[PDB]
């Protein structure tokens, strides 16, 4: 509503302002009193899909597990690696970021002391054991689950993890709601992934691949920023380069899909006939 409620509660609200306030608050009470049914039915579906899964071994005997990286949406690094790899047992032994060192062994639980020795060495990402990669028939082994979470140690042989997991996902169901180009922020080094590129005539490295990931790696080794750069964008920078904080490093036009080339030469109209294939629309306000 274009006219706000300029009066607080210490000054008096008049009539219209309180009525607009009642719009805004009746919507919230209706949302909670109808949201709670979906939250409870979500907890029910979750504890009946889980319902069976019991910690029933001590090691499945595998070497597979998901690759825990810190998550980065495009702003500053949102959830650090110490939040994701706290108390989860590594899959293979993490190499120290210098060269080929056995920093941690390959079946160690990562409690707070190990995670601090991970944060000192600025470890990139940890290949850690996940429950979906567990090889145990009819249950989850004790290492592929992780830390007990309300006990400091590993999960005991027996403790029902499906039900506590289903409750822990569905329990915050009440608090949840129901109803141009790239500008860098920090100052570091450039790295490109999924890139197949070419240098244009002016010098800005344009990209012949749609799915290119533009990472900003710091001077330490960890990945601090990530972005998605489209097919055919004007990169102000290049691979492995050092930039300044706030300098624009990418540019494109999304309303005009570029059909840029790899080589040079002359242009011919192959199967382009005016009258059937293409049409003649001379511009009104420009003339070109």
């Amino acid at each position: 509503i274009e006219t706000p409620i300029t009066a607080n509660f210490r000054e008096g609200l008049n009539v219209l302002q309180y009525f607009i306030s009642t719009h805004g608050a009746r919507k919230g009470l209706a949302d909670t009193a109808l949201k709670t049914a979906n939250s409870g039915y979500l907890t029910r579906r979750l504890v009946d899909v889980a319902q069976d899964l019991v910690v029933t071994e001590d090691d499945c005997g595998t070497h597979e597990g998901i690759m825990m990286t810190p998550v980065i949406e495009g702003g500053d690094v949102k959830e650090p690696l110490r939040d994701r790899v706290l108390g989860r047992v590594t899959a293979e032994d993490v190499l120290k970021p210098g060269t080929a060192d056995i920093l941690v062994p390959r079946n160690t639980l990562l409690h707070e002391q190990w995670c601090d020795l991970l944060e000192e060495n600025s470890v990139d990402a940890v290949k850690v054991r996940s429950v979906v990669s567990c090889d145990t028939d009819f249950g989850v082994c004790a290492h592929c689950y992780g830390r007990d979470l309300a006990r400091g140690h590993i999960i005991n042989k027996g403790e029902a993890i499906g039900v506590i997991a289903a409750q822990s996902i569905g329990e915050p169901g009440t608090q949840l709601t129901m109803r141009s180009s790239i500008q860098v922020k920090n100052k570091g080094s450039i790295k490109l992934s999924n890139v197949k590129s070419v240098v244009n005539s002016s010098g800005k490295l344009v990209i012949t691949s749609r799915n290119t990931e533009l990472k900003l790696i710091d001077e330490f080794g960890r990945t601090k920023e990530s972005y998605k750069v489209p097919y055919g964008a004007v990169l102000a920078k290049g691979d492995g380069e050092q930039v300044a904080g706030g300098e624009t490093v990418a540019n494109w036009d999304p309303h005009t899909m570029p059909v840029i080339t790899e080589v040079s030469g002359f242009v011919r109209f192959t199967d382009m006939i005016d009258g059937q294939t293409i049409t003649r629309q001379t511009d009104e306000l420009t003339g070109l």
Binding site: T43, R151, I164, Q167
Partner: protein, 251 residues
């Protein structure tokens, strides 16, 4: 069973079975009498629809009804639904040795103990008090003990403080969402009629004190007392199982 009065409040299945038997008797009599084809086709069709209405009512076209327009409840409707046997009597049951009252604060408590009223304590612990009274030798038969606690003499409160002492109880707030909503305490007896609940523990139950109610349950057997002390005690739940964050945070 009859309700309070002189008539029998009959179940719906008796209507269903009584109709199937009425129709089956009619069909046997018509096959005795050699009625023509269309009569016994309607008779067997009414029996088919009667059996199909008995088993799963309303899966066929519009369900039959006795009183008044509401359809009557069949066997499959004794199984299925929110109020069948699974979701209403086998997964969740009503429970003896249990109680319920309004909560209040009582901040003098240590966080392994909760306040529990004397009237609820003498009602929930009637068999332990009976066993204690029969051990001392104050009475003889069970009747005498039930008269003693029906009168509430001066000697059963010492018996009650000697059955409480190291015996945990399960406090439970009514919308239990995660496992920290059932926690086991040790009772401390309360002159009053309200459960005194230690304040830090409230942030686990999502329990404010604006009119809330909680249920108490008594672990009867010995393995259940040990599970209440060793797994479900309130000192043992100081970290939320969803993460690593402490749940006994000062509110």
């Amino acid at each position: 069973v009859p309700l309070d009065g002189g008539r029998f409040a009959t179940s719906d299945l008796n209507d269903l079975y009584r109709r199937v038997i009425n129709r089956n008797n009619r069909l046997k009599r018509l096959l005795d009498l050699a009625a023509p084809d269309i009569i016994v086709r309607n008779e067997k069709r009414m029996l088919q629809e009667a059996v199909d209405a008995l088993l799963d009512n309303g899966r066929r076209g519009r369900a039959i009804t006795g009183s008044n327009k509401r359809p009557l409840k069949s066997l499959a409707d004794m199984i299925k639904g929110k109020q069948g046997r699974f979701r209403q009597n086998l997964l969740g049951k009503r429970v003896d040795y249990s109680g319920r009252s309004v909560i209040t604060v009582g901040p003098y408590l240590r966080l392994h103990q909760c306040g529990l009223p004397k009237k609820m304590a003498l009602e929930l612990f009637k068999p332990f008090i009976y066993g204690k009274l029969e051990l001392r030798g104050l009475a003889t038969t069970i009747k005498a003990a039930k008269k003693m606690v029906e009168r509430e003499e001066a000697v059963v409160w010492d018996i009650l403080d000697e059955v409480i002492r190291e015996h945990p109880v399960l406090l439970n707030r009514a919308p239990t969402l995660h496992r920290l909503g059932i926690q086991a305490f040790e009772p401390v007896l309360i002159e009053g009629k309200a459960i005194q609940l230690h304040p830090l523990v409230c942030a686990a139950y999502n329990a404010d004190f604006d009119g809330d109610q909680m249920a108490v349950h008594v672990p009867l057997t010995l393995e259940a007392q040990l599970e209440a002390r060793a797994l479900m005690m309130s000192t043992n739940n100081i970290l939320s199982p969803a993460n690593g964050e402490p749940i006994i945070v000062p509110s």
